[PDB]
C-alpha cells in the first residue's frame, strides 16, 4: 500500500479580502474584487437573437 | 434703418424628452440622454500628474 499524500485545497481571496475555495460561494457571499460601474452589452445578431 | 430678424433659440433636448436652451442649466435640471454606468478613468503621467 503506497501512502496518497495530500494537497490543500487553495483559496481565492475576494472582496474586503476574504478568501473561499469555490467561485460562486466567494461571489456570491463577498462579491468581486474591483468595482466595475456596469457593463454596456453590445449584441450582434438577428433581431430574434436580439429577444 | 435695415431690419434685424430675429431666429428663434433652438432647444436642445436632455433628459426625459425636456427641452432646455443651455445645455449647462439643462444637464442639471434633467440629466444627459444615456446613462451610461460610470466612468473606467484611466490616467497616464507623472506621479504628481495623477496626483
Redesign the interface.
Known amino acids: 500500500m503506497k501512502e496518497l499524500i495530500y494537497i490543500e485545497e487553495p483559496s481565492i481571496l475576494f472582496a474586503h479580502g476574504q478568501k473561499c475555495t469555490d467561485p460562486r460561494d466567494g461571489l456570491a457571499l463577498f462579491g468581486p474584487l474591483n468595482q ?5 452589452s453590445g449584441v450582434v445578431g438577428t433581431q430574434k437573437g436580439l429577444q
Request: aromatic share 20%; charged share 20%; hydrophobic share 40%.
Open positions: 466595475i460601474y456596469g457593463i454596456k
